[PDB]
Amino acid sequence: RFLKVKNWETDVVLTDTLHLKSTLETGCTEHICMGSIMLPSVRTKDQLFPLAKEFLDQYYSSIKRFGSKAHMDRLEEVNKEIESTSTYQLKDTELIYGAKHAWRNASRCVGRIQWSKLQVFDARDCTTAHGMFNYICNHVKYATNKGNLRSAITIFPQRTDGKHDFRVWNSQLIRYAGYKQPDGSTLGDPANVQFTEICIQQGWKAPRGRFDVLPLLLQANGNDPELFQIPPELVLEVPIRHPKFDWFKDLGLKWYGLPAVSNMLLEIGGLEFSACPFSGWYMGTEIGVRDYCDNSRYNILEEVAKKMDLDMRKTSSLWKDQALVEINIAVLYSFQSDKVTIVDHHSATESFIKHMENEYRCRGGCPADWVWIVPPMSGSITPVFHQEMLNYRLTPSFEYQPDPWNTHVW
Template sequence: MTALCNEMITGAPVTFAAAEDFLRMFHDAHPEAGAVRQRLAEVRAEIEETGTYRHTHQELCYGARVALRDTGWCTSGLPWRRLKVRDLRGIHKAQAVATQCFEHLRLAANGGKIQPLVTVFAPDRPEAPGPRIWNPQLVSYAGYPEMGDARNIDFTDSVEALGWQHPLPRSAFDHLPLVVSAGLQDPQLFTIPREVVTEVPLTHPDLPWFADLGLRWPAVPVISNMRLRIGGVDYPAAPFNTWFVGTDIGTRSLADESAYAMLRPVAIHLGLDTSTDRTLWRDRATLELNRAVLHSFDTARVTITDHYAETQHRLAWLRSRRNRGDRPAFRPHSSR
C-alpha cells in the first residue's frame, strides 16, 4: 500500500484542448446550459490569463458523476446521475479538509442506507497544488508485522514516523488517523471521531463460532487517494464512495494472504484438511467468509451487493463504455 513520500506536485497549466473536449460533452448532455461556443470562449480567455479555469457547479457535478461511472466504481443498480456531489472547492486547509471528510463519513453511512457521495475540495492551480488525502480509504486499519491489515504496513510505519501512537494493546482493527497535506505543507494527522465510523461486526448464519473470530469491517468504502480529473483540471482531494461488493471484503481483504490471511484460521475451525490444496480447503473457507459478510451486512441493514449482481453490471458497463477524448476520471496520483 502506498506510503507517504516527499512528492512535490505543482499544478501544470490546463490545456484548452482538454477543456474543450469536456465542455462539448457536457453541453451535449445539457443543452439547457446554453451555447457551447460562448462557454468555450470564456474558458479559453480564462486559461490564457490564469493557466486554468473554474468549472461551473453543474459542470463539476456532471464531471464527477461521469468519472465515477466510467471508472467502473459505480456499483450495480446505482443511478449515477443522482450521485450526490459536495462542492467544497473553497476548502484547502488541512483541518477544514479533515472536518469535511468526517462529515462525508457521517452523510455516506446514512443510518445503513449507504448514500453514494463525492466530496470535491480545492483543485490544483499552476502556482500551487490543492490539498491531498494520503489514506487509501478514509477508514482503514493499521497493519503490523504480526496482525492487522498487511496491505497497510508501510502506511502505518509512515504515520508512526509522523507521530501517531498506536493503541495499547494493539489489535487487528486499529483505526489509522486521517493524513492530509495542504498545498506544499507537510502532512498533518487527524484522529477520526469514533461517532462517524460505522462498522459491521461479522457473524455467520450457520456457524456460531465465527463471531468469536472478532472480525469487523467499515460499512462504507470511501476511496480517498485518487485525484479527480475533469476537462484538464485536477482535484487531488476528492473522496468518493458507493457501497461494498461482498467479495471486496470477504475475498480481497479477509481471505487474501497479503491482507488479513483468515483462510487458514477459518479452515481449521471448519475441520478441513489443509495439508494440500487439492482438498480445495481455500475455496470452502473463502465461501464461508463471503457468506458471513453478506449475512452480517444484511443483519445490520447496511447496503451491500454481491458479486453476481456486480458482474452483470460490469458487463453492461463494458458494452456501453466509450473512450472518447479526455473524459473525466478518477486516476492514481502517479498519473498525470
C-alpha cells in the same frame, strides 16, 4: 472500426462506437496486450484549452444545447480565463457533471449502474487541513446514513502549480492499521504497514490492535499533513458472524461499512483535483475474498478451515474453496443483519450487465476492464465472465497518482 462485443452465454451482440472518442492510451499495442498490468506507468496554456473545449463540448451536448449561444459564450469565457490566469474554474453544474462522468467512465468499477445518483460536495473553498477534516467528517456522516449508504464525493481545490497540492494521504478514509511484529509476522492489515508507520512517525498513538481505525493525514495547499481522528460514532463497523457456525464469532473479525477511496486524482476538462475522496458501498467479495483471504492481507483461510475441521493435507480436497464460500456467506449475513448496505457479487454483476446494455443503447458503449470486473470468486457463474468487454480511457476520469510521501518536500 465499429467494434462488436459478444456475450457467449446469451449470444447478445452489442456494437461499440464510444471507443472512437477515447483519448488517452491503454498500455497495449498491436504486438502486446498489457490488459493484466495493474499500472501502465502542470498543464501548459496550450495543453489546457483543447481539454477544456472537449469537456465543454460534451457538457453542452448533454444538456441539448450544443452549438448554442450559452455554449459558445462559455467557451469564449473559459478561453479568456486560460489566456489570463493560465487556468479556469468550473461552474457548479460542470463540476457535478464531470464527477458523475468520471465515475461513469471508470472502466474498473462494477457498480456504475448507480453513476448518475452521486452526491457531490464542493469543497473548493477549503484552505486548511482542519477544514479538510470538517469536510471529510460531513462526507462520512452523509454517506454512512446510519447504514443506508449513499454514494458521495468531496472535491477539494484543484492543482495550481503542483507545489500547493491538496492531498489525502490515506488510501481510504477508513482503513485498519498494520504493524510489524518483533518476531516477523504482521498484526492488523499488512497493506497499511507503511502508512501506519508514517502516522506514528508523525505523532499517532497506536492501540496496536488487529482492527485499529487509522487517523486521517490531511495535506492542504502543499503544507505538511496533519493527523486527525475520525469520531468513532461516525465510523460504522460490522462484527462478522456466521448464520450456521457459532464459533465464527470467536475469530474476532469485523469490517467497516464505508468504502471511501481517497488517493486518486479526478481530471475534469484538463483540471486536476488531487484530493477527491469518493465512496459507495461494498461488494461482499471485496471484504470476504480479498481483504480477508489474500495471502498478503489478513490471510485467514488457514484459521477458518481448521475451525471447520477440513482436510487441509491435500489441495484437491478444495478446503480453501469451501472455507472461502463460508467466509463470504458470513460477511453478507453480517452486514444484512445490521442493516448496512452491501451487494453480493451475483447481484452486482447482474446489474452491471443491465448497465452495459443501457450504455450501449443510449451512449454507444461502456469501457470495461474484464480483469477487474469479474469477481475474485465463482467467476464463471456470474454473467460478466461470459461478457466480452472493450477497455479504453475516456475523460472525465479518475486516475492513480504517486503516494505523496514519495513526492512531498517535507
